[PDB]
Amino acid sequence: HHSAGLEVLFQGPYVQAFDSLLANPVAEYLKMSKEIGGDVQKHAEMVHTGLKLERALLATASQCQQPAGNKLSDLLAPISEQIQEVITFREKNRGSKFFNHLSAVSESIQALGWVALAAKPGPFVKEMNDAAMFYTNRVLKEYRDVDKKHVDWVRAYLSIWTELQAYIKEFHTTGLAWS
Amino acid sequence: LFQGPYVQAFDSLLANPVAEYLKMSKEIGGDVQKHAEMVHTGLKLERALLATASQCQQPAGNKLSDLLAPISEQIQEVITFREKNRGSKFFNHLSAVSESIQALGWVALAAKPGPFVKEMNDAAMFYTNRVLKEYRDVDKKHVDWVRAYLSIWTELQAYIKEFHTTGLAWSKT
């Protein structure tokens, strides 16, 4: 029937593989972000939308021929706007009580842009996760023996990019496999 | 970073209704703010699918459903929020959104997308009329919220009529 509209659909193989690797880190990161609240919670919602746009692009690639140099930026404009949204939130909230949490995310979120690389996407995400780790090391120093929910937040966030590296390694090693 | 023709034409029509809806929802807060963030996410996936349609040759059956699977998940997330928040002080605001959000599913139809979105707008209108009955003469922010939300689907219909009147136009090459 038409009144029901678009029913829930099963994800194709590219996204199924992505979800099996990234579901548990993403869920834990979203749980701990809600527990911390404030700016950490607001930022996680933006990261979660970035991840949802990551899956939408993987689905595109599984059914689409890689377009011309210029024509690809038209496909990546939705994910690059979301990456910038996550970055400008940190830039506008420099007075935040959770600045290092905001910095860990803004300085690593560009990892979602691995889909724009035709060579070495894995080392790119490793370098992004090294930047997240610098700021998360500060969160650990401040909260390791004060608030354990911040310690799990750090571990949960960093494993998103560790699990993204495992996904790229298994399926898209030499770059996102376009149709 | 810069948007393609399909999405730029969408933004020309939907940027101001969407912004107004998000600002009013934040003013109301609570469950209305929570729901609007889910609607904004759905609208972002809509744009992503319009960018896919501009550069991609139309897929058949299962290949097409694989493309639509991200947005279908988000539409359902908007719908399950209302079904799980029946004890809400903003139940009609919640109902207005969940009974109309399937308008984002127009991208799946092979014919007549406008009357489909119109029917979703009729459902939004039934419940927004209950928000108006209740909150006009109480708080005019709810009146501005209704006007903002209904105009999203009014401007969507103008986008469909102008560019994708017989169905979503996919790339021919």
Author numbering:
A (entry chain D): 29 to 207
B (entry chain A): 37 to 209
Give the text the authors published on this PDB structure.
Another actin-binding protein implicated in filament disassembly is cyclase-associated protein (CAP). It is conserved in evolution from protozoan parasites through yeasts and plants to animals, and is thus among the small number (<10) of core actin-binding proteins present in all eukaryotes. CAP is a relatively large multidomain protein, which can self-assemble into oligomers, most likely hexamers. Here, we reveal that CAP promotes rapid actin filament disassembly by accelerating pointed end depolymerization of cofilin-decorated actin filaments.
The N-terminal HFD domain of CAP is critical for actin filament disassembly in vitro and in cells. Interestingly, the dimeric HFD domain was able to strongly accelerate actin filament depolymerization at much lower concentration when compared to the monomeric HFD domain. These data demonstrate that the HFD domain is the functionally minimal unit for actin filament pointed end depolymerization, and that its oligomerization decreases the effective protein concentration needed for this activity.
